[PDB]
Amino acid sequence: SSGLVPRGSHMQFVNKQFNYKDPVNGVDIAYIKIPVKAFKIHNKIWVIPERDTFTNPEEGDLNPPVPVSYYDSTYLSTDNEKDNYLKGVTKLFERIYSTDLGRMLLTSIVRGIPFWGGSTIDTELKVIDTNCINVIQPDGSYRSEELNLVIIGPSADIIQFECKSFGHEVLNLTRNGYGSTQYIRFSPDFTFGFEESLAGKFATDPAVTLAHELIHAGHRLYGIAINPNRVFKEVSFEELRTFGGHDAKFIDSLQENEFRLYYYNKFKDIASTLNKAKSIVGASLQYMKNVFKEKYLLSEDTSGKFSVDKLKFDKLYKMLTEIYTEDNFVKFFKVLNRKTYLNFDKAVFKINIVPKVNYTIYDGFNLRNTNLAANFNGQNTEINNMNFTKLKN
């Protein structure tokens, strides 16, 4: 009746059919701090169904202080809302995982463990603490858990979706190869409007919007994000690259070679940090070393000495930067979507994707064997008016 399992017996990426009221259990349902209740949907990925008053101390309140923006301090405050959020997000990951491209993308993310580059001693491997959360256990104690990704509700401006992470005092973790745990502010309960001529009035599929955010996550997890000071007169190269298509092509090919070579070298610094490593604080040295051999697709010799293969680097680098794009998701989903990142949004809408009469894992809104199946009729905010309520612009 949500339709979380259209084929087979169980869900294929998300590990449980959770309800928000399920008892805390210390393993995959727990109280955590970065004191909130959270759900572990997969190895290395948690969902926290709460407005984000947490990650930024100048954003501990949902008060309006306003370009494209939308506020409502009441959103995501009841338990039924929280249960809907969590099943909505759950359903999206299963939608993303039903495609070849999304199975590739989500695997890369789970294997993308932030580098253990914490030590001040250049021969000791150590974790970085902002790449963990604290999980209250079955007895009542904490333990620190390493994770790659957190999906969390939006702060004051409900439609400011973004992917962010905590910084280091010396290191630039999103741009040195290392990586860092990524926080996605997102909601499945809202989407955006754009115009299209088959003038037509359509809404973006929220699977494609989550996928955009997850693509920024992969860049930042393998530490290969573009400096945000590189822009067009504003859109950064980092956005142009994530959208892909013809928009990406205006990053000149000589600039690309220069970017790729800079990061070949950073992956080279990482290989030799692994090699010049003698101790580990906090599993063996050689076991954690092999976690990172596996992440960065490193070669090992008879000495047990790691290096960067050039084919293997180009392969991973190309997958993360060129293949994993918004544009390519649109192709796999067979949905309607904006043709360039340069598009101005018009309206915001309230939606409910949880019931299978409203949205499915295979078709999104554009439900097969009905009138919704043709001409992107399900994303038409007049024909399928039932499924979209207008709120701003």
Ligand SMILES: N=C(N)NCCC[C@H](N)C(=O)NO
């Ligand atoms: N109208 C939207 N689709 N808003 C959410 C994304 C906003 C931001 N420009 C961005 O692309 N962040 O990754």
Ligand SMILES: [Zn+2]
């Ligand atoms: Zn973006």
